[PDB]
Design a protein around this ligand. Structure first.
Ligand SMILES: CC(=O)N[C@@H]1[C@@H](O)[C@H](O[C@@H]2O[C@H](CO)[C@H](O)[C@H](O[C@]3(C(=O)O)C[C@H](O)[C@@H](NC(C)=O)[C@H]([C@H](O)[C@H](O)CO)O3)[C@H]2O)[C@@H](CO)O[C@H]1O
Ligand SMILES: CC(=O)N[C@@H]1[C@@H](O)[C@H](O[C@@H]2O[C@H](CO)[C@H](O)[C@H](O[C@]3(C(=O)O)C[C@H](O)[C@@H](NC(C)=O)[C@H]([C@H](O)[C@H](O)CO)O3)[C@H]2O)[C@@H](CO)O[C@H]1O
Ligand SMILES: CC(=O)N[C@@H]1[C@@H](O)[C@H](O[C@@H]2O[C@H](CO)[C@H](O)[C@H](O[C@]3(C(=O)O)C[C@H](O)[C@@H](NC(C)=O)[C@H]([C@H](O)[C@H](O)CO)O3)[C@H]2O)[C@@H](CO)O[C@H]1O
Ligand SMILES: *[C@@H]1O[C@H](CO)[C@@H](O[C@@H]2O[C@H](CO)[C@@H](O)[C@H](O)[C@H]2NC(C)=O)[C@H](O)[C@H]1NC(C)=O
Ligand SMILES: *[C@@H]1O[C@H](CO)[C@@H](O[C@@H]2O[C@H](CO)[C@@H](O)[C@H](O)[C@H]2NC(C)=O)[C@H](O)[C@H]1NC(C)=O
Ligand SMILES: *[C@@H]1O[C@H](CO)[C@@H](O[C@@H]2O[C@H](CO)[C@@H](O)[C@H](O)[C@H]2NC(C)=O)[C@H](O)[C@H]1NC(C)=O
Ligand SMILES: *[C@@H]1O[C@H](CO)[C@@H](O)[C@H](O)[C@H]1NC(C)=O
Ligand SMILES: *[C@@H]1O[C@H](CO)[C@@H](O)[C@H](O)[C@H]1NC(C)=O
Ligand SMILES: *[C@@H]1O[C@H](CO)[C@@H](O)[C@H](O)[C@H]1NC(C)=O
Ligand SMILES: *[C@@H]1O[C@H](CO)[C@@H](O)[C@H](O)[C@H]1NC(C)=O
Ligand SMILES: *[C@@H]1O[C@H](CO)[C@@H](O)[C@H](O)[C@H]1NC(C)=O
Ligand SMILES: *[C@@H]1O[C@H](CO)[C@@H](O)[C@H](O)[C@H]1NC(C)=O
Lengths: 325, 164, 325, 164, 164, 325
């Protein structure tokens, strides 16, 4: 008669590491780290992202005529820009503070396109001849941005002073844009805006702006030696904007009512397809569907994701050392 | 094991015992059979579920990188951002890997000590009424049926009775 | 005859947690974390903070007439701005590089107000009519900043060129301010400064500055459609400043001798009362009087404070497991 | 305990002993009484004071947030700052909470092992001259007065003498 | 030691034994001499080389400061950078110092337990054929030559033979 | 007959610390931390650093005449600037975006000096009289920068418009510089460039630039009350630059073909000697030759270095507690 003391074992070949010992087979363990992803973009909070498709953010927001697919209202959980999107700023120039604009739009959820300054606002000038072959639509070789208007002196006289006001009596901030045209020589300046010193100025309660032309000849870009300095701002609820110019004004026309998220916000540069599925965690690399604590797919995500980490495995032993025989 | 038990003086394990981590293999006139010590098993189980849930809980924060872009004249703050993100990535990677290694070591040591202590629990009860082989098996001098074995198992083994 | 081996126990019901076990009563433990604070602002290094009271930092440093309580010299261990202080920039405009100025003043310990340019410096102009109902004192409806002076052409003639010099022969850096007046239309520009192109320029060894007016009509703010661009700088020991303008100059008048701390420096936005007590650690949330290692009150402090942390408790067992019976 | 002693085979503790962590309860003709083993007590005390002071010492740095303000066009660097401050906050919170948990576990295990080892210290001395009940009490076969008990306590118990 | 062995009941160490960490000092008719237990030694050696290499491996990243300069109006981002660099410096300093302390503690405990377990390994073999002094020396009742000692050493000690 | 169980000991007095115990002598340990350095600058990847010697980075890259030792091509593993180097910007002015230029050059490996605009580019003006006693060479009291040229109206007539083009048809980016001269008064302006409003303008595909003079009297610096605004840019492969000015142009003359490293890059401010040795790890404080994991010399390095840390020692016990007797 006898009795023995001992312990469990099994068919397991799952291994772990310790400070003292690598490759140690154990009975039961758990893997804390996810490495599997679905290479696609899905919905977040049952809300679908924005596919810019063949438009860049600039081309979208400025109203590039080949970006008319995106025109009007938009709502998004996040934004997807495509690596080699072709339509952005068609008429050569710089968007001032571009990076901060990208960050601001990143922090958004929705835009409502509306008309802020009808062409009638600008009195004694030509609001109908503002076009260039730098900016074609899919239906003509010479157009311009849908949200801007290129004011040019009336077919004879000089450029009068022109003035505009918009009082933001609503509850939402307004994103809007304008520009200054920098011509390549004196004669073009005169052909478009007539002679004399020219200015563009803009005032709000908490912002003012003045600028004159910077006339010089630049390298040809989309067949243009002229430039445009693009500018963007946000008219807060309660604020009101005064526009005043006697020449070279690329005047705001359409603008956006903007909804700030207060949460994180993401803009993904990627080529992954957007599919009609759902997700609670969305990396730039793909979707994670897990209950695990760690992940090694990507540090860039929107939603509720595991802590990104460089490890291959994070295997934690729960059972004892396996010694079958 | 540092307590000498698992893959030590008890040289191996019973694939036979499928209802617990630690237990028994008796041998008497009615037959043999395996049976796990549910008490110290459930103790280990609760303690280790606790370890795992505490580890998952403490790890429930995420440092969060951002898609922010930087111009040609913002090289410095761009690099600053990169160094920050990589930095934090490095420390969390380290914390995780190190913690896993260490904790595995101590988990195994825990199992080992629980075994050792069960062995001791028994030997302490049966002192003269059996023969300690030294490989964690005990050979009775007297007779032990099922109501006998059971009393050892549920810790109520009457040593006076069988000492004569 | 016998002898027993055993261990301590007691009336303690204090508990701790372990990786294996939560809620475990022990004989002796220690709490490393402080959660108790005194909701007030006390002295640091036996030195009292600065209460801006109903002034903002801008209103204080520019010499807003309703901030005359703060006028003259000041010394501080730290600064307290009140959440809804009403007196800041009275005449509408922007303080250029405001945030960096706030940071710089944050890094300070003391200011000595002195006169840097007497009104006599400016020759052939009117130094006595520079007032507006945008900037009232508690005793008249039209005044201006104590540290600035609004130069206007003499009651007939034109605006001559005017010039000023201050050679900083002392051992301390000087904080000082000036401005450019941006009028709403041509006729006001002419009524104040006369006709012709106007400039404001300022030179030191390591800084220069030029700016012209940016004339346009802006929304009414404190009944003004004009603006002022405010500017600030630091004249280093050894440096000397040249002022030159032919119009639109809001000239420096008073300035500050500044003492840099080289230590951290704090500016607290808060409504807590400042009391006549002492302290060796001062958070924005209150005072900590502790010898403990951690705290969960606030990450923002001046002085010697425990490491801020999000934990509720950090209880460390020193005695053994308690098993009385 | 992993050494089996505290709340193990020694099932509970003596509120009676108020002058040490570990000790004794003798029982003889002059009477009984409690008395703590000052040596292994003072050892534990020094080691654990050391643990606590090392922990406090290593934790004697503070990451320091700042009141710095950022304009409307400084959203990016503002967010960068926030992410940094929260980041560091997260890692220090984690380090603290985790270290506390772990260290408590090992502290308790330490107390347990110190007890176990005192028990062993005794049993090793008295080998035949007493009866090991198995609950950490020892029953003499001979007579033990106070100068007798004392010699066990200060470790100078003469086994030859009482073996006959 | 928490296992009671090193500087415990085995009160000191043999400078004589220069070919291992743990081992033996026999004493018989041919003479005495020291000899180390190469098995548990090589085990300790491999485990601890492993500890050291894992520690070095996990520590194989560097946060990297930069010489970048900041103007007079870049005080804020300058300070941001400084706070970041010092921050990371602080956490890596802490991690290193703390890890060293802790790991040293557990290393020593490991050595202690390995000794204790060797002692047990022996005692378990020789049960009646010798006398346990309690200071980790064993006194034979019978005769033990070199082929005798050797069989204890390589773990193949025949207890039946010498029990009579 | 008997046998004993025990453990190793030795002549070692090396100590370690534990959480429970400080000062504990052990048999074998290892030191993970290096504290020894060689106070010198050695080669990296068998490539030698650049010693600016008595030149600052500005003085080097602008072509200060006393920095002619550095003129022409240069290659480096890293850069060494000397604490009190005397030759930088000789003619008083500001280098715009200096810090970013320092960072950019830091990220480099090599420059090839070449001529970008021969003086012939500028037509109808005097390219041979651009000198000042602010900028002496070691051989005359009045020279100027080797990489810039000071254009002045021809000894009678007025300043014509002048134009330049460089089309970067090569595979490397070009670093280049120019300036605007800010005179102290009207008469100097007229003596150098003649009367009338003056401008300087520069265009590329992705950059444009316009600026006018900012005429005022400044404090004397190197005997000059005038200033120069220095500017720097990078002409990318494929881009081309147009230069156009009618006055006050400090024209680019020589420029650099630049090689970007994509690795880290270092600029060390230090006085340590550069010696003809080799190294795989180079701090600002000295060279480390180690196989150890940690170091406490410096956080600033180039190459493969141990992790910087504040510890004095990081001693790790491998053997057991030493108890000889
Ligand atoms: C060899 C060389 O450099 N030749 C140029 C010559 O090309 C250039 O003419 C310009 O050429 C481009 C080529 O794509 C366009 O044809 C320009 O036309 C328009 C335009 O479409 O953009 C017509 C348009 O209606 C005008 N816009 C408005 C609102 O009136 C504009 C506008 O005048 C310019 O964009 C001003 O920037 O141009 C055409 O001008 C000439 C121009 O000086 O210069 C030669 O050297
Ligand atoms: C319906 C409407 O828009 N009406 C405005 C009319 O209000 C405005 O007159 C200005 O009105 C404000 C109202 O608070 C003040 O009364 C302005 O007065 C002063 C001023 O106090 O600031 C008088 C002051 O003495 C002047 N300062 C100096 C140093 O001379 C200034 C100064 O002229 C202006 O501040 C320039 O900015 O104004 C008063 O001008 C008129 C002005 O054009 O416009 C109507 O459309
Ligand atoms: C007491 C006082 O302030 N007197 C100044 C008087 O010094 C100043 O004359 C200038 O003095 C400096 C002193 O070092 C130089 O001599 C200036 O000479 C040059 C120069 O070398 O830089 C001659 C040079 O050939 C000129 N350069 C060219 C390209 O033509 C320049 C150039 O004119 C100036 O640098 C413009 O900045 O100067 C000399 O001009 C006079 C000047 O107004 O003012 C007195 O008040
Ligand atoms: C810069 O140089 C290249 C020459 O290599 C120019 O390239 C030409 O561009 C035109 C259209 O702009 C093409 O039709 C030619 O066939 C190209 N030829 C070659 C050889 O590249 C380039 O346009 C030049 N640009 C400027 C502004 O000078
Ligand atoms: C913008 O619109 C509102 C209208 O809602 C204007 O508000 C008025 O402001 C004056 C004083 O400035 C008050 O006395 C009126 O009673 C207000 N009325 C209303 C209906 O709000 C506001 O002033 C406008 N501002 C501009 C610059 O257009
Ligand atoms: C500012 O003040 C000091 C006076 O202390 C001036 O210093 C003089 O400088 C000249 C050369 O520039 C020397 O030769 C004199 O001997 C110096 N004298 C003294 C007393 O310092 C300084 O130059 C002044 N600068 C300006 C621009 O005002
Ligand atoms: C661990 O095991 C894997 C196979 O499961 C083997 O390929 C690898 O080389 C081993 N590594 C070490 C360090 O033993
Ligand atoms: C032990 O086992 C018997 C059954 O064999 C049971 O009836 C008895 O009550 C048990 N007692 C305890 C204390 O476990
Ligand atoms: C721990 O104890 C408290 C009471 O002291 C109790 O309210 C809480 O639920 C317990 N938590 C756990 C996890 O046991
Ligand atoms: C032990 O106790 C006796 C008193 O009972 C004392 O005199 C003796 O010297 C002590 N010796 C040691 C070694 O503790
Ligand atoms: C033990 O030692 C003897 C030599 O004394 C050797 O021949 C024998 O084979 C060894 N056996 C084992 C299992 O170590
Ligand atoms: C540790 O030992 C050194 C000498 O090796 C001594 O000077 C120091 O004071 C000791 N420190 C502690 C805390 O024991």
């Amino acid at each position: 008669d006898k009795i023995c003391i001992g312990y469990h074992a099994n068919n397991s070949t799952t291994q772990v590491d310790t400070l003292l010992e690598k490759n140690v087979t154990v009975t039961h363990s758990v893997e804390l780290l996810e490495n599997q992803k679905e290479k696609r973009f899905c919905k977040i909070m049952n809300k679908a992202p924005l596919d810019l498709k063949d438009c860049t953010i600039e081309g979208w927001i400025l109203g590039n005529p080949k970006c008319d697919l995106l025109l009007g209202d938009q709502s998004w959980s996040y934004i997807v820009e495509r690596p080699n999107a072709q339509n952005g700023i068609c008429y050569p120039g710089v968007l001032n503070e571009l990076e901060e604009l990208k960050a601001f739009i990143g922090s958004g959820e929705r835009v409502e396109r509306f008309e802020m300054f009808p062409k009638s606002t600008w009195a004694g000038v030509d609001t109908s001849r503002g076009v260039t072959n730098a900016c074609p639509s899919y239906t003509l070789d010479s157009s311009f941005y849908r949200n801007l208007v290129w004011l040019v002196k009336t077919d004879s006289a000089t450029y009068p002073v022109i003035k505009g006001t918009y009082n933001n009596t609503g509850t939402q901030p307004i994103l809007y844009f304008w520009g200054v045209h920098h011509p390549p020589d004196t004669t073009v300046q005169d052909n478009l805006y007539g002679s004399g010193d020219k200015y563009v100025r803009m005032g709000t309660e908490s912002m003012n702006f003045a600028k004159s032309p910077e006339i010089a000849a630049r390298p040809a870009v989309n067949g243009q030696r002229s430039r445009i300095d693009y500018y963007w701002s946000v008219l807060r609820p309660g604020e009101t904007l005064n526009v005043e110019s006697n020449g070279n004004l690329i005047a705001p026309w359409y603008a956006y009512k903007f909804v700030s998220t207060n949460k994180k916000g993401a803009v993904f540069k990627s080529d992954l397809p957007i599919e009609n599925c759902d997700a609670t965690c969305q990396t730039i690399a793909g979707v994670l569907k897990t209950n695990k604590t760690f992940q090694n797919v990507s540090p860039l995500w929107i939603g509720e994701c595991p802590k990104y980490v460089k490890s291959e495995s994070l295997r934690l032993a729960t059972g004892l050392r396996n010694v079958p025989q | 094991g540092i307590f000498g038990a698992i893959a030590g003086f008890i040289e191996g394990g019973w694939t036979g015992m499928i209802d617990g981590w630690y237990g028994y293999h008796h041998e008497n006139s009615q037959g043999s059979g395996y049976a796990a010590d549910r008490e110290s098993t459930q103790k280990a189980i609760d303690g280790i579920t606790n370890k795992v849930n505490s580890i998952i809980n403490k790890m429930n924060t995420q440092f969060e990188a951002v898609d922010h872009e930087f111009s040609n004249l913002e090289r410095r703050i761009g690099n600053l951002n990169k160094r920050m993100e990589d930095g934090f990535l490095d420390v969390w990677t380290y914390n995780a890997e190190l913690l896993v290694l260490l904790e595995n070591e101590r988990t195994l040591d825990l199992h080992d000590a629980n075994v050792k202590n069960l062995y001791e629990k028994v030997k302490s009860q049966l002192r003269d009424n059996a023969n300690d082989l030294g490989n964690g098996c005990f050979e009775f001098w007297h007779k032990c049926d099922n109501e006998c074995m059971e009393s050892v198992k549920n810790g109520t083994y009457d040593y006076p009775k069988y000492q004569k």
